[PDB]
Amino acid sequence: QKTLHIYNWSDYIAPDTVANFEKETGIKVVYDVFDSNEVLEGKLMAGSTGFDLVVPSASFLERQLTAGVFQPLDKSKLPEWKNLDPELLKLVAKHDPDNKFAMPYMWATTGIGYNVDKVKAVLGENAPVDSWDLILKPENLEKLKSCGVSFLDAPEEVFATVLNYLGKDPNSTKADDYTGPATDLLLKLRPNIRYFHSSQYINDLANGDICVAIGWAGDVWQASNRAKEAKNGVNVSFSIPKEGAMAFFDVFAMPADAKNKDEAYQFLNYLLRPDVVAHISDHVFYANANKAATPLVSAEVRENPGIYPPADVRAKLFTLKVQDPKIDRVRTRAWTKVKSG
Ligand SMILES: [Cl-]
Ligand SMILES: [Cl-]
Ligand SMILES: [Cl-]
User: Fold this and answer.
1) What spacing in Å lies between the alpha carbon of 33 and ligand 1's midpoint?
2) How many CB atoms lie within 10 A of CB 173?
3) Which ligand is nearest to the CA of 148?
4) What pairing do the DSSP bridges indicate for beta strands 287-288 and 149-151?
5) Backbone angles phi, psi at 313, to 5 degrees
6) 44-48-53 Cα angle (round to 5)
7) Of the bound ligands, which one is closest to the alpha carbon of residue 11?
């Protein structure tokens, strides 16, 4: 029997996607999840992952390509490749030249999830929910400490966001930008942050246990929808702040030592069907990269400007660049100071 090992982000697939693929193809799927680019990259660099498909962010895949940990996708086994948005392909091609290694899957932004009522109770009806001031200004965060604050456990994203907020290059190659103002601000914020974590904030926003989080858009929209279906009265929203925000593109890639490559190609082409991936978007509240699928996704997802943002909001989004070894070391050490204490 055929078996296929997949390592994807958590909360990133419809409930029935895998079961439908199994019953159509007869392949048994082993499906596991992660919430951290650093965890996946560490697996890729330490040895065999034991997976046939993994899903890094494109900015991390750029770094991973030069280690040789992926093999190029045979485009002749991906006929539905045509369905992909060419403009998104061109953006991902900045990380994966000529799109040789990566199939764009979902994309979104790193912004602010928050409890509408709690934030307005603490900072007033005019709470600056359209601005990184909400969480990155120490006076505001000290007051939101009362109802719970979480940051992503995602150092490249947090530092780029802080740097942009401070008016620096989000991808500054100036070491002092990291050790000076970025670390200073983050250390001022630190005593107000309940935890650093990239998946617990979903149920904690849904449950009312935290009131504001740095989070990924569709994760926050999932939390909003979980509160709605529980009818617990918790109102969660998501903000792409006025100063801009990081955009990311999560992409399927094939490890160089993948065991069941024919089956992996069958799954990638399954995900390229417009009806298959639109249905995923319906359940996970993320924009997919499939331009033929967009009319098939539900109106409540397609028309949400925090999921499919319009041109003027997209014009304010930035993306990660790969840093040299000095900056990587400086950023990692500063993250360590921030996250342990
Ligand atoms: Cl996990
Ligand atoms: Cl007020
Ligand atoms: Cl706390």
Assistant:
1) 6
2) 12
3) 3
4) unpaired
5) -75, -40
6) 70
7) 1
